[PDB]
């Protein structure tokens, strides 16, 4: 589940199998020639599924990833505030180590890097609502506010087909790029980290889409490769 804390969560669990991720269509980072992306977005209405929270979904971080993620703004219900799945980069996911969190809310990309107590079954809702229960937790619980080294909001292009992220790390420094079109790239943020990130995860996005609606979260990611000359 990598993630040690047992969160108290508003979601059912089942032991169903899950189809393998479905395939696409000096120092330099790129994706390979005829590379093939895999969709890691998972979705439920009601329950999460325990097999969601292990490999191949929990994936090796290596030399980074290039990702493109559908904007589900328009297929979410009325009050919804998260328009696409949150991703989580880190190592052991414990209070002993830094985890990058990139989570949209409304018009913003909430970026943060902290020592999070991440859940066993971390997830995200398109329209999260707790009937005033502070004990409840979705993807983390921290009774103490954790040491962060970056908590910064960035602006999201609310009306835009798909977003394009690049995440890598060199000399301990994580680098984040964003765009809303494939013709451009814009520096998001970068921060130095004491650990080195070895794993990543796209949290299951659960949502009650309204009417006869194809709720198709997609989070396609290919890896990056390193090369020094």
């Amino acid at each position: 589940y990598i993630g040690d804390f047992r969160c108290i969560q508003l979601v059912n669990s089942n032991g169903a199998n899950v189809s393998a991720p479905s395939i696409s269509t000096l120092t330099g980072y790129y994706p390979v020639d005829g590379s093939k992306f895999r969709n890691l977005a998972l979705t439920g209405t009601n329950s999460v599924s325990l097999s969601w929270f292990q490999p191949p979904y929990l994936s090796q971080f290596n030399d980074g990833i290039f990702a493109k993620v559908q904007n589900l703004k328009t297929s979410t219900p009325s009050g919804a505030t998260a328009y696409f799945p949150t991703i989580v980069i880190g190592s052991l996911f414990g209070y002993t180590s830094y985890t990058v969190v990139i989570e949209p809310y409304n018009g913003v990309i909430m970026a943060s890097v902290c020592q999070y107590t991440i859940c066993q079954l971390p997830y995200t809702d398109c329209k999260p609502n707790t009937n005033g229960n502070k004990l409840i937790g979705f993807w983390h619980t921290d009774v103490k506010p954790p040491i962060c080294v970056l908590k910064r909001n960035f602006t999201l292009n609310v009306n835009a087909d798909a977003f394009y992220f690049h995440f890598y790390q060199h000399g301990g420094t994580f680098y984040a790029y964003y765009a809303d079109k494939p013709s451009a790239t814009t520096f998001l943020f970068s921060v130095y980290i004491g650990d080195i990130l070895t794993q990543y995860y796209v949290l299951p996005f659960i949502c009650n889409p309204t009417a006869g609606s194809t709720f198709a979260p997609r989070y396609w990611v290919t890896p990056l490769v390193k090369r020094q000359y």
Binding site: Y1, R6, I8, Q9, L10, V11, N12, S13, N14, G15, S47, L50, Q120, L121, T130, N131, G132, N133, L135, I136, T141, V143
Partner: protein, 199 residues
């Protein structure tokens, strides 16, 4: 402190069992029920979130189990597979006391055994063999003589784990009505009687 009591401890197939909890902590974050001696999330049956008055299911949920706000869990149609230990886990803020467990046992009601005889009208100073025959492997086998427990004695032998009763010399004081009965922590049935007239 929190104890837990199976009502009943011995349940017949296709009957209900209530894991009755005395006596929950009054302000809990959540509490859950698990299959067996464990709090492994894959053995979680159902779960309750007290502040949200909402219940949730887990991998071990079979569809015939109800969790109550008061800690208790209701099984509906027990199957031999349901029999075992069950673990109640209680989470406060944010410490969890694993440390209610309960064990219950399920059994099939026994069917009527059949009593078999060599001669029904056996002669004095000759052996009789009585055989209690049933379709109840794993039932207990008791012998009856005139409705009361049969007195063991010295010249009686019981073999095949109480299946066959043998009495070599039958003195006149062995005349009467013989039955076997198979028991089972949830059922008792008595065999057809057999009447030895030692002539």
């Amino acid at each position: 402190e929190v104890t837990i009591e199976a009502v009943p401890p011995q349940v017949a197939e296709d009957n209900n069992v209530l894991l009755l909890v005395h006596n929950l902590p009054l302000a809990l974050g959540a509490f859950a029920w698990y299959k067996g001696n464990t709090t492994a999330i894959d053995k979680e049956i159902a779960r309750f979130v007290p502040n949200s008055n909402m219940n949730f299911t887990g991998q071990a949920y079979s569809g015939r189990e109800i969790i109550y706000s008061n800690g208790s869990l209701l099984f509906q149609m027990i199957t031999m597979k349901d029999m075992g230990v069950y673990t109640l886990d209680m989470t406060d803020e944010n410490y969890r006391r694993t440390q209610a467990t309960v064990r219950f046992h399920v059994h099939q009601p026994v069917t009527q055994p059949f009593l078999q005889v060599t001669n029904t009208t056996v002669k004095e100073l000759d052996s009789v063999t009585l055989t209690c025959l049933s379709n109840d492997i794993g039932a207990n086998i008791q012998w009856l003589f005139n409705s009361q427990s049969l007195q063991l004695t010295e010249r009686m032998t019981l073999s095949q784990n109480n299946s066959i009763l043998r009495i070599d010399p039958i003195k006149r004081e062995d005349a009467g009505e013989y039955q076997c009965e198979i028991s089972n922590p949830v059922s008792v049935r008595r065999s057809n009687s057999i009447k030895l007239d030692i002539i």
